Write a protein that binds this ligand. Structure first.
Ligand SMILES: [Zn+2]
Length: 59
């Protein structure tokens, strides 16, 4: 993980998209990269993805 105090919601890079990370997107745990289901853009995982239900919990 990453020390410090934070907890901002991961938002699709694309400014026009701004689609909050959803369980529908194509998550490539292997390449730690989840592509968007709408804009279809690859995004990098956040620094702190431990206290996240979307990830921790199954789709
Ligand atoms: Zn997107």
């Amino acid at each position: 993980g990453s020390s410090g105090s934070s907890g901002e919601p991961v938002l699709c890079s694309r400014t026009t998209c701004r689609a909050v990370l959803n369980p529908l997107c194509q998550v490539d745990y292997r390449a730690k990269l989840w592509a968007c289901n709408f804009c279809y853009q690859r995004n990098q995982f956040p620094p702190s993805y431990a206290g996240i239900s979307e990830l921790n919990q199954p789709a």
